[PDB]
Amino acid sequence: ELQLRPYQMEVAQPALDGKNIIICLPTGSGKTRVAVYITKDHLDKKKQASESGKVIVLVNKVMLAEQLFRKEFNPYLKKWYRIIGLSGDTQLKISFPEVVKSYDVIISTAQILENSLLNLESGDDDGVQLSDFSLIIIDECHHTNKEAVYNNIMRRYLKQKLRNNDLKKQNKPAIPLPQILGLTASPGVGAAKKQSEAEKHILNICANLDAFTIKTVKENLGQLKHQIKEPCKKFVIADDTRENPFKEKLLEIMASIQTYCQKSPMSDFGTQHYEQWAIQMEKKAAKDGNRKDRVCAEHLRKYNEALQINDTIRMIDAYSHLETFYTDEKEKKFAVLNDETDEFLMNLFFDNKKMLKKLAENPKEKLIKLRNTILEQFTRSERGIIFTKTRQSTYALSQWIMENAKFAEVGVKAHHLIGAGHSSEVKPMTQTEQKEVISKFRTGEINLLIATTVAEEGLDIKECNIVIRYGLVTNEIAMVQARGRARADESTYVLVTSSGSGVTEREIVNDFREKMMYKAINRVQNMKPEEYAHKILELQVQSILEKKMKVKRSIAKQYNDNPSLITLLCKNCSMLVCSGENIHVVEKMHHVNMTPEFKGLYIVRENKTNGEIICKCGQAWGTMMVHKGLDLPCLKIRNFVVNFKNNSPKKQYKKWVELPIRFPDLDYSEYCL
Amino acid sequence: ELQLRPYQMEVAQPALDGKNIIICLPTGSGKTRVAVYITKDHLDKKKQASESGKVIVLVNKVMLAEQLFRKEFNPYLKKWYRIIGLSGDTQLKISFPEVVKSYDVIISTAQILENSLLNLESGDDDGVQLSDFSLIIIDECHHTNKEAVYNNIMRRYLKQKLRNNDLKKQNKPAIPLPQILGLTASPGVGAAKKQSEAEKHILNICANLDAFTIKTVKENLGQLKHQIKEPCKKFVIADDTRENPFKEKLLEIMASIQTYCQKSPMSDFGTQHYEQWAIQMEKKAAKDGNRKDRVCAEHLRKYNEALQINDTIRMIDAYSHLETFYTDEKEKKFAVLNDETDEFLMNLFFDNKKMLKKLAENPKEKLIKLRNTILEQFTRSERGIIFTKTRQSTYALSQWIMENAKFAEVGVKAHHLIGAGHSSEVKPMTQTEQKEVISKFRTGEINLLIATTVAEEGLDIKECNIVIRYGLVTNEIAMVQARGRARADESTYVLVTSSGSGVTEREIVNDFREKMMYKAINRVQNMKPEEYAHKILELQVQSILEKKMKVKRSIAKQYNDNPSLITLLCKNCSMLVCSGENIHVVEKMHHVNMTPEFKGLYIVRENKTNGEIICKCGQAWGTMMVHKGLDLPCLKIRNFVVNFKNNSPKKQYKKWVELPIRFPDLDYSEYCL
RNA sequence: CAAGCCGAGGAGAU
RNA sequence: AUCUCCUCGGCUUG
RNA sequence: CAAGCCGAGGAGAU
RNA sequence: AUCUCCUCGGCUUG
Numbered sequence A, B: 001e002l003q004l005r006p007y008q009m010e011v012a013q014p015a016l017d018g019k020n021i022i023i024c025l026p027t028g029s030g031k032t033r034v035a036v037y038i039t040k041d042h043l044d045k046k047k048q049a050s051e052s053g054k055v056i057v058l059v060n061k062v063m064l065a066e067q068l069f070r071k072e073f074n075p076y077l078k079k080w081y082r083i084i085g086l087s088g089d090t091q092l093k094i095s096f097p098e099v100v101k102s103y104d105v106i107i108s109t110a111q112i113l114e115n116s117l118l119n120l121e122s123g124d125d126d127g128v129q130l131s132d133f134s135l136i137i138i139d140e141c142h143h144t145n146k147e148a149v150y151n152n153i154m155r156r157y158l159k160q161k162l163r164n165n166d167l168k169k170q171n172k173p174a175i176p177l178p179q180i181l182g183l184t185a186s187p188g189v190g191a192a193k194k195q196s197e198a199e200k201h202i203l204n205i206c207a208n209l210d211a212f213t214i215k216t217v218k219e220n221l222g223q224l225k226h227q228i229k230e231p232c233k234k235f236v237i238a239d240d241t242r243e244n245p246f247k248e249k250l251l252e253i254m255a256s257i258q259t260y261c262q263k264s265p266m267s268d269f270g271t272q273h274y275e276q277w278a279i280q281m282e283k284k285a286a287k288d289g290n291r292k293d294r295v296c297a298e299h300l301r302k303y304n305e306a307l308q309i310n311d312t313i314r315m316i317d318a319y320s321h322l323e324t325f326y327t328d329e330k331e332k333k334f335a336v337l338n339d340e341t342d343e344f345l346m347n348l349f350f351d352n353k354k355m356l357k358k359l360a361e362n363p364k365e366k367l368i369k370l371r372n373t374i375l376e377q378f379t380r381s382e383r384g385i386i387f388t389k390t391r392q393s394t395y396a397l398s399q400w401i402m403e404n405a406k407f408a409e410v411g412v413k414a415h416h417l418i419g420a421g422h423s424s425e426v427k428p429m430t431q432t433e434q435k436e437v438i439s440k441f442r443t444g445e446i447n448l449l450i451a452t453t454v455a456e457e458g459l460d461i462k463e464c465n466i467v468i469r470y471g472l473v474t475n476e477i478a479m480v481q482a483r484g485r486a487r488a489d490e491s492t493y494v495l496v497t498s499s500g501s502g503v504t505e506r507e508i509v510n511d512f513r514e515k516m517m518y519k520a521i522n523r524v525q526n527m528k529p530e531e532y533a534h535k536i537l538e539l540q541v542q543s544i545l546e547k548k549m550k551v552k553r554s555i556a557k558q559y560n561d562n563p564s565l566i567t568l569l570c571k572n573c574s575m576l577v578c579s580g581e582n583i584h585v586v587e588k589m590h591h592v593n594m595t596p597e598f599k600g601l602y603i604v605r606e607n608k609t610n611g612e613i614i615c616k617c618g619q620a621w622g623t624m625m626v627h628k629g630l631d632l633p634c635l636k637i638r639n640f641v642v643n644f645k646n647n648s649p650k651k652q653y654k655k656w657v658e659l660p661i662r663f664p665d666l667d668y669s670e671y672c673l
Numbered sequence C, E: 001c002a003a004g005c006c007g008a009g010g011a012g013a014u
Numbered sequence D, F: 001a002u003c004u005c006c007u008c009g010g011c012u013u014g
């Protein structure tokens, strides 16, 4: 039942017989089916050759593993050969090393294979080796970067290949190397100004993957052009001339606070430079142990945030954010009670809270023209996607769609999607919820999906009529991927952003980067085999050598590991909180203090299933981890300061591993009875 | 007359002189006779040593106690020493504490000993202590888990041992500790990915049992391999491609109901996630007190059940289940009479009942291939067991065997067996009936026994030629036990399940778990005695400490016990049903309401020797318990809602003890005259 | 034979 | 940690 | 479902 | 090289 198209067979012909290559075709070009056919043919050849046929497939995202196992690989190849799909969400309850030699076909995330190989090197597990495989297939090869995971596996393979090459001249016996196939659409450019540098980057990618070709379609290119229709470009610009009253009032309170705390800004208000200066002042206050510096800096950062989102988000969201932050602060202080500067800030906000609320309520936007374009397009159509910067922006957009009655009149369905993980005050989503949202959009129940960069990569959809980016541009690879994600016969590509910012210049930069992409692929494809191979060998040895010395330097970097040489103090108040030995380590990951003498210092607080800790000052410290029954008080070094026993050089790390000195584990015999 | 085999003596030699150990041999390896010989030798040594010899045997199942008392222990050891067999079914009319010091040999379920020790601690009874015994023997040691009953007894013993160890350094006098012997075949793995974690689990088991060895046969292993023949593996797969017409019609009515009640599914149809969402909506409706939510959710759950069994059961059973459920509902409503949505559901079923019956009657299965394999094997043989998920599945299989004429032509005898207890709409069986069925199968009168997980553990049979699992896999321990239960010279092991499900992956996972078992036992057996003992002591103190703080937390959890602070309302209709004090408690277990004012609210209903109660809405509430003459109306909190006097936070418990506030007992003087 | 109560174990999904 | 689904033992009542 | 830990990638500013 | 801001994967705990 397997089917092929003339361009598919043309591109895949070299790979049918050896030729460990890369295939760079646009999105929705059957690349998945090309890989499926190549796998089927390779396994058929292995069976005909009376040789073991092992195929492994690597995908950076967890979801794409299930997607391939469900839609392309298993349905077409279920009957002939055994198939299994592995992932972090999936419980590989059997093992990796033997399932390698059980099902003859593996689809797994790269990190699992990497972990298995590291375990083998450590010797704890029997482990697996690349020799066990006969064919390695990689999706989204552009991620093979300086030391990405794909790059780690490929560096191991390339060290093996270099050893094999050395033996070729030294000794006949050699370790077999599986064939390598890579699939991508935009290999990418490492921000290279010179087309020489662009082709250098392309050759670096090839060397990392040992591609020895790109093998792009040239004959049936007209057929592809007919098949795939590029979306129509559209540029939208805006100016934040309005918002004067409330913005001016907010700036006035900013200036009042700044003069109260005499902060020479050393930058213009409303920029990342100002936030960096504020954080540097945070650090300086930590090294000096004074107040009046960190609280005001954090408040200014929050107001700057509010302003930046306001340029792209409605005020109500910013005001709610600020109100929640101040509510949390007030609850902290109220719990602690049970200075004139914190009082100044809080009482200033309380006194002006009503007037600020009324002032934000008044009129005086990108939002009005965004609504105009969206509804005009929807009537002109009788799917849509929004790409933005931060998750709260997606939530605000969803709220705007729901509340506004015009969208209800149109009846467009919408839902907010965001990435997983905890990212500094954005709620972590769950993978199952992401799969649910994607499936709901696929079945047509959701007509408008708002997503962050997550949807840019993978997250394939059969068609997406409308792709409207909203103030998001990062690089050419993301731009091209998002553009190709439309896959609709009649697509509409729109970019919305402020004219003052450099975002339009960035979009045209990405356009030229795409053009330079092709300008470099066509060049590299036409190169002398001898000089070409010399370049690949050079780049391969470069990568291997760099990795070797990187490992050496990492070994040489972390060596001190002293038992106890410091005193840990509260950052807000320079008081002796803990010694260099009273701390204990559990699970080899978490830190705790068990002596009750500490319990007389900190204050437990719980308002919400794990409580938290706070200082006498109100500074948050950590949580109460319920492990093995024990409610161990875990503390985050992110909210503490260190004082070495000698010279008292105060240092703040935000992180434990950055501290070279180690702490002892918790001996449960100590807490006997 | 006692006999031993070289592997038996080899494994038992360490235990002959002290050495409180575990013995892990495959099934049917004489383990029972090994225990009998060890007991006999120990008692002979005690007599020769002029010391009291007390032996106690613990079995988790009630039936195995009688089995050991009948087949292995008493017949061989009747003459030399007194023997008695205790159990829940058996009436220990004398007492436990003195029969400990009466017959010199005890065979009892662990729970009885546990209860006696708890009574001793409470002081109500004179009680018994482990010191009274000289040897404790445990069967199926793998059940010694986080706080299993075996684990509770072993934790008490280990606290005693820790006290004795402390005295060893402090004071010469110490409390003697009886020797400990354990018998098992598959100690098990706690779903451990790392062989380090597997051996950690094994060491945890040893510490709980103080085994200090495993002592597995290594020398005569060839003799065991020759003696015991492993069954031949066989994998059977199927796809539910058929069933399209009636399944599609059922899905259509599902969709009609869902759109009528606008249930955003938040999951795919036909999965436990959908049922969980339905129950969450049950809870939400309870907190809001609206209809149109719970009835439809329950109907959808019933249809989802029907579908799931249909994948593995004939439709007629599902249709009969649905028909009985709707008949019960209609009888409820008819009794109540003597909304448009309940009417919608019931009238929809009535209108389509004839067409649904005809549609289920038509053709379009795992059943056909199951019948094929069963009959082909039976002719190829000229006993059989089926393991399944739910009891109604066993009943359907028995009906299929009886009705189908092909089995009659073969003449295979078959009967259905299931576990005891009430498990949410599956009839509770009786222990005597289970013993009857087992004896009938043993005597050869039954050639095919269908059983649930109950037959997996214990329920020993001299031989079982055929073991065919049918869509049942839970863990490696159950798999290995069932596999070894065959014990036939020429066995046939078969696993039948759908290809779409992950059941085959599970079976191979259990296979690798068995392999990892041996990979960990061989490792632990070869360990340094000092480091080993350090690990056992560590794990023992861990268990003791965890149990201590668990008891402390349990004490700290249940403290409120308020007399009357709530109002109890009907879940279906938010009406005031009872106050916080009008309820009374009897037998210290049952709850009742005595005031006749309540009798004017609920409706008594009886259709069948205890009647039941229903609301004005038709919601079932409870029964009429005939205790001490009184027909007290007992109500199940499972079908009610609570409303606290303050803040009215509605909460549903399904259970009484979960409610921390207590109710008064029934004072019979109140109901005088 | 029926009903009820207390605890415990395993699997699946959040 | 939670929810669902299955299984074991002990106790009581009739 | 919640929390925590390890690594990695991209963009911006010094 | 540093700081900031965003995203991915793996692990653990409950």
Ligand SMILES: Nc1ncnc2c1ncn2[C@@H]1O[C@H](COP(=O)(O)OP(=O)(O)O)[C@@H](O)[C@H]1O
Binding pocket: A003, A004, A005, A027, A028, A029, A030, A031, A032, A033, A460
């Ligand atoms: N052999 C073929 N015959 C007909 N159509 C094909 C064939 N191969 C691919 N296609 C078309 O190309 C598309 C393949 O998209 P796909 O490769 O899954 O996108 P992506 O690679 O981005 O996941 C399908 O929508 C299908 O209609």
Ligand SMILES: Nc1ncnc2c1ncn2[C@@H]1O[C@H](COP(=O)(O)OP(=O)(O)O)[C@@H](O)[C@H]1O
Binding pocket: B003, B004, B005, B027, B028, B029, B030, B031, B032, B033, B460
């Ligand atoms: N000393 C012996 N001499 C001969 N045969 C023995 C001896 N001990 C055990 N056997 C054989 O081993 C089997 C023991 O099975 P048994 O231990 O009762 O199974 P389980 O332990 O699963 O209940 C018997 O069928 C018997 O033939």
Ligand code: ALF
Binding pocket: A026, A027, A028, A031, A032, A185, A458, A459, A460
């Ligand atoms: F392989 Al794609 F979108 F190009 F999933």
Ligand code: ALF
Binding pocket: B026, B027, B028, B031, B032, B185, B458, B459, B460
């Ligand atoms: F002791 Al057995 F089956 F192994 F009863």
Ligand SMILES: [Zn+2]
Binding pocket: A570, A571, A572, A573, A574, A615, A616, A617, A618, A619
């Ligand atoms: Zn402080």
Ligand SMILES: [Zn+2]
Binding pocket: B570, B571, B572, B573, B574, B615, B616, B617, B618, B619
């Ligand atoms: Zn009611």
